[PDB]
Design an enzyme around this catalytic site. Structure first.
Site, PDB file in Angstrom:
ATOM      1  N   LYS A 137      45.592  -0.955  92.027  1.00 19.41           N
ATOM      2  CA  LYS A 137      46.288  -1.861  92.937  1.00 19.41           C
ATOM      3  C   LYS A 137      45.636  -1.834  94.320  1.00 19.41           C
ATOM      4  O   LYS A 137      45.392  -0.763  94.879  1.00 19.41           O
ATOM      5  CB  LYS A 137      47.765  -1.479  93.011  1.00 19.41           C
ATOM      6  CG  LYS A 137      48.619  -2.411  93.836  1.00 19.41           C
ATOM      7  CD  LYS A 137      50.089  -2.182  93.533  1.00 19.41           C
ATOM      8  CE  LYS A 137      50.974  -3.114  94.332  1.00 19.41           C
ATOM      9  NZ  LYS A 137      52.399  -2.731  94.222  1.00 19.41           N
TER      10      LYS A 137
ATOM     11  N   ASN B  48      58.672  -1.970 104.901  1.00 25.62           N
ATOM     12  CA  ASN B  48      59.055  -0.626 104.492  1.00 25.62           C
ATOM     13  C   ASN B  48      58.061   0.439 104.936  1.00 25.62           C
ATOM     14  O   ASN B  48      56.859   0.186 105.016  1.00 25.62           O
ATOM     15  CB  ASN B  48      59.232  -0.567 102.971  1.00 25.62           C
ATOM     16  CG  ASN B  48      57.942  -0.252 102.243  1.00 25.62           C
ATOM     17  OD1 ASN B  48      57.622   0.912 102.001  1.00 25.62           O
ATOM     18  ND2 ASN B  48      57.191  -1.289 101.889  1.00 25.62           N
ATOM     19  N   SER B  49      58.577   1.627 105.224  1.00 23.18           N
ATOM     20  CA  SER B  49      57.740   2.806 105.399  1.00 23.18           C
ATOM     21  C   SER B  49      58.361   3.972 104.642  1.00 23.18           C
ATOM     22  O   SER B  49      58.690   5.011 105.217  1.00 23.18           O
ATOM     23  CB  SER B  49      57.554   3.143 106.881  1.00 23.18           C
ATOM     24  OG  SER B  49      58.736   3.682 107.443  1.00 23.18           O
ATOM     25  N   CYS B  50      58.507   3.771 103.334  1.00 18.69           N
ATOM     26  CA  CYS B  50      59.180   4.710 102.450  1.00 18.69           C
ATOM     27  C   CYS B  50      58.402   6.030 102.471  1.00 18.69           C
ATOM     28  O   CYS B  50      58.960   7.102 102.689  1.00 18.69           O
ATOM     29  CB  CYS B  50      59.269   4.118 101.044  1.00 18.69           C
ATOM     30  SG  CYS B  50      60.794   3.208 100.726  1.00 18.69           S
TER      31      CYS B  50
ATOM     32  N   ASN C  93      49.245  -5.263  97.293  1.00 18.55           N
ATOM     33  CA  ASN C  93      50.287  -4.447  97.894  1.00 18.55           C
ATOM     34  C   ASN C  93      50.771  -5.100  99.183  1.00 18.55           C
ATOM     35  O   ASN C  93      50.469  -6.266  99.437  1.00 18.55           O
ATOM     36  CB  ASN C  93      49.768  -3.029  98.148  1.00 18.55           C
ATOM     37  CG  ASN C  93      50.864  -1.980  98.056  1.00 18.55           C
ATOM     38  OD1 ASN C  93      51.928  -2.125  98.653  1.00 18.55           O
ATOM     39  ND2 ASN C  93      50.605  -0.921  97.297  1.00 18.55           N
TER      40      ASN C  93
ATOM     41  N   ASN D 221      51.736   3.668 103.969  1.00 16.44           N
ATOM     42  CA  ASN D 221      52.770   4.600 104.410  1.00 16.44           C
ATOM     43  C   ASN D 221      52.359   6.078 104.544  1.00 16.44           C
ATOM     44  O   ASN D 221      53.013   6.817 105.280  1.00 16.44           O
ATOM     45  CB  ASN D 221      53.970   4.509 103.473  1.00 16.44           C
ATOM     46  CG  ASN D 221      54.747   3.218 103.636  1.00 16.44           C
ATOM     47  OD1 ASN D 221      54.518   2.456 104.575  1.00 16.44           O
ATOM     48  ND2 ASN D 221      55.730   3.003 102.764  1.00 16.44           N
ATOM     49  N   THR D 222      51.313   6.520 103.844  1.00 18.91           N
ATOM     50  CA  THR D 222      50.732   7.851 104.100  1.00 18.91           C
ATOM     51  C   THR D 222      49.282   7.781 104.598  1.00 18.91           C
ATOM     52  O   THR D 222      48.456   7.084 104.002  1.00 18.91           O
ATOM     53  CB  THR D 222      50.765   8.770 102.860  1.00 18.91           C
ATOM     54  OG1 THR D 222      50.121   8.132 101.751  1.00 18.91           O
ATOM     55  CG2 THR D 222      52.195   9.119 102.488  1.00 18.91           C
TER      56      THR D 222
ATOM     57  N   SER E  40      51.123  -9.999  92.591  1.00 17.76           N
ATOM     58  CA  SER E  40      52.242  -9.453  93.341  1.00 17.76           C
ATOM     59  C   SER E  40      52.124  -9.937  94.776  1.00 17.76           C
ATOM     60  O   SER E  40      51.076  -9.778  95.403  1.00 17.76           O
ATOM     61  CB  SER E  40      52.262  -7.924  93.286  1.00 17.76           C
ATOM     62  OG  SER E  40      53.380  -7.411  93.991  1.00 17.76           O
TER      63      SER E  40
ATOM     64  N   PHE F 126      56.703   8.180 100.497  1.00 16.95           N
ATOM     65  CA  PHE F 126      56.254   8.161  99.112  1.00 16.95           C
ATOM     66  C   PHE F 126      57.278   8.926  98.301  1.00 16.95           C
ATOM     67  O   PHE F 126      56.969   9.721  97.409  1.00 16.95           O
ATOM     68  CB  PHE F 126      54.796   8.693  98.928  1.00 16.95           C
ATOM     69  CG  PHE F 126      53.839   7.679  98.322  1.00 16.95           C
ATOM     70  CD1 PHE F 126      54.278   6.415  97.938  1.00 16.95           C
ATOM     71  CD2 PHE F 126      52.486   7.967  98.196  1.00 16.95           C
ATOM     72  CE1 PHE F 126      53.425   5.501  97.400  1.00 16.95           C
ATOM     73  CE2 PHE F 126      51.620   7.024  97.655  1.00 16.95           C
ATOM     74  CZ  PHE F 126      52.096   5.792  97.263  1.00 16.95           C
TER      75      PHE F 126
ATOM     76  N   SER G 181      48.250   1.722 100.099  1.00 19.55           N
ATOM     77  CA  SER G 181      49.592   1.939 100.598  1.00 19.55           C
ATOM     78  C   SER G 181      49.438   2.272 102.060  1.00 19.55           C
ATOM     79  O   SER G 181      48.611   3.108 102.431  1.00 19.55           O
ATOM     80  CB  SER G 181      50.336   3.044  99.849  1.00 19.55           C
ATOM     81  OG  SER G 181      51.583   3.315 100.463  1.00 19.55           O
TER      82      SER G 181
ATOM     83  N   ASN H  17      47.230   3.364  92.703  1.00 20.69           N
ATOM     84  CA  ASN H  17      47.222   2.631  93.945  1.00 20.69           C
ATOM     85  C   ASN H  17      46.636   3.494  95.031  1.00 20.69           C
ATOM     86  O   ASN H  17      47.119   4.584  95.341  1.00 20.69           O
ATOM     87  CB  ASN H  17      48.639   2.159  94.316  1.00 20.69           C
ATOM     88  CG  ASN H  17      49.541   3.288  94.790  1.00 20.69           C
ATOM     89  OD1 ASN H  17      49.544   4.383  94.228  1.00 20.69           O
ATOM     90  ND2 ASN H  17      50.314   3.019  95.839  1.00 20.69           N
TER      91      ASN H  17
END
Ligand SMILES: Cc1cc2nc3c(=O)[nH]c(=O)nc-3n(C[C@H](O)[C@H](O)[C@H](O)COP(=O)(O)O)c2cc1C
Ligand SMILES: Cc1cc(Nc2ccc(S(F)(F)(F)(F)F)cc2)n2nc(C(C)(F)F)nc2n1
Ligand SMILES: O=C(O)c1cc(=O)[nH]c(=O)[nH]1
Length: 374
Positions: A238, A113-115, A267, A186-187, A314, A117, A184, A181
């Site tokens: 996280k 995923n590259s949601c 993550n 993605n950003t 996780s 945020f 991540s 967290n």
């Protein structure tokens, strides 16, 4: 029941044909209108667990990113989970990166995923968590169920801390715990907050803001903390798995000095290249392929912290066996995400069964006895 079974057929079908984020939103909507099934089973008192004075009726919850906006908290919890982590939220609403941004490989049981945020923002999500908390006072099945909130900074925000401080003030009263967290992919610029110096800064600042909520209100704890614990929220952090051994020990020190309440390991990961459908794709990978990486990371941090900081698992948990590896490795609690995508709504009932039976066959009295047995 046939309820579960029939729904799982619909899901398997949807998984085959329909885009991932479209499916996700579809079933969140079904949950929002409360037409999903319930697990009304009593949970084994031998599979209870806790993190400090925060108690969980069973050891399985849903991970952050699944119900980002807290729109489906009741229905998901009633699938058999003891807790859920909503968010990650940010102080202001974001659209996130361009779609499609989530893809699934079925054969490998993995996701990327590259949601980046997407969420409705802290304000709106706080209203959603409040509404839930009101429903929880009336619902027999939501009693003793835990809701954590994952919090992070908006995309173009210079400082992380100013973002998180806003989030705590708005939603901290309704949270049983807070997950920070800085993990991540993605950003840009988020993960550099994993340095030990900036981390320590962030962690402290979060505890102080929570502590400030207590000080500035004049009410007792009953009428101040509109959550489940009726106490101030615990503070977890996280961590991403893509660190070197020096980073991990550097961080390991921080968490001790700050006396943080727990750490969520882990993550998603960027270091997986053996998934064929994903070669075109950017983002972080989760699911089965993340399982062995994740577990190792728990053993490391469990050792580096010398077993003082509780761990929340996780990464590639699908079976009661997978779950026990995380527990023996050092986890007190487990979080599911990819399992719900590939195994469907039965995942909580199923995984609790499998773990209860194994604890027996492995001769464990209860789950707590098995924690950190490596
Ligand atoms: C589409 C998607 C969105 C996610 N969003 C978040 C998030 O917003 N915050 C977070 O901490 N983790 C997020 N995650 C990571 C999950 O919380 C979890 O740590 C990871 O997927 C590993 O779990 P699993 O192997 O059981 O799937 C996301 C994962 C996916 C696949
Ligand atoms: C068939 C399917 C289902 C799904 N997620 C999902 C699955 C089930 C439920 S639920 F929670 F049905 F009750 F269990 F609503 C909620 C979310 N996702 N999530 C994705 C993804 C990876 F894009 F987020 N693809 C999916 N495909
Ligand atoms: O929502 C996201 O962009 C996201 C956050 C996170 O922590 N992990 C992830 O894989 N995606």
């Amino acid at each position: 029941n046939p309820e579960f079974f029939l729904y799982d057929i619909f899901l398997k079908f949807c998984l085959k044909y329909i885009d991932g984020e479209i499916c996700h939103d579809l079933f969140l909507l079904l949950g929002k209108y409360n037409i999903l099934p319930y697990d009304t089973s009593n949970d084994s008192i031998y599979a209870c667990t806790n993190i400090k004075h925060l108690d969980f009726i069973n050891p399985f919850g849903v991970a952050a990113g699944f119900d980002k906006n807290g729109v489906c908290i009741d229905s998901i919890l009633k699938l058999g989970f003891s807790f859920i982590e909503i968010g990650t939220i940010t102080p202001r609403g974001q659209t996130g990166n361009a779609k499609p941004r989530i893809f699934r490989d079925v054969e490998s049981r993995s996701i990327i995923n590259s949601c980046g945020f997407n969420n409705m923002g802290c304000d709106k999500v706080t209203e959603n968590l409040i509404l839930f908390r009101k429903r929880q006072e009336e619902d027999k099945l939501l009693s003793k169920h835990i809701v954590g909130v994952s919090i992070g900074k908006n995309k173009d925000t210079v400082n992380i801390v100013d973002d998180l401080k806003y989030c705590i003030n708005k939603i901290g009263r309704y949270a049983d715990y807070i997950a920070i967290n800085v993990s991540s992919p993605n950003t840009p610029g988020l993960r550099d907050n994993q340095e030990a110096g900036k981390l320590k800064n962030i962690i402290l600042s979060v505890k102080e803001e929570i502590d400030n909520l207590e000080k500035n209100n004049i009410m007792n704890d009953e009428f101040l903390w509109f959550n489940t614990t009726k106490k101030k929220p615990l503070v977890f952090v996280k961590l991403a798995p893509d660190l070197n051994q020096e980073q991990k020990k550097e961080i390991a020190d921080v968490l001790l000095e700050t006396n943080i309440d727990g750490m969520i390991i882990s993550n998603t990961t960027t270091q997986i290249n053996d998934i064929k459908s994903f070669e075109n794709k950017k983002g972080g990978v989760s699911g089965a392929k993340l399982k062995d990486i994740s577990t190792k990371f728990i053993c490391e941090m469990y050792n580096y912290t010398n077993k003082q900081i509780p761990i929340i698992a996780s990464g590639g948990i699908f079976s009661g066996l997978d779950a026990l590896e995380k527990i023996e490795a050092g986890a007190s609690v487990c979080q599911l995400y990819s399992c719900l995508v590939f195994n469907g709504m039965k995942s909580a009932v199923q995984i609790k069964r499998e773990l209860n039976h194994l604890l027996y066959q492995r001769g464990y009295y209860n789950l707590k006895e098995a924690i950190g047995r490596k």
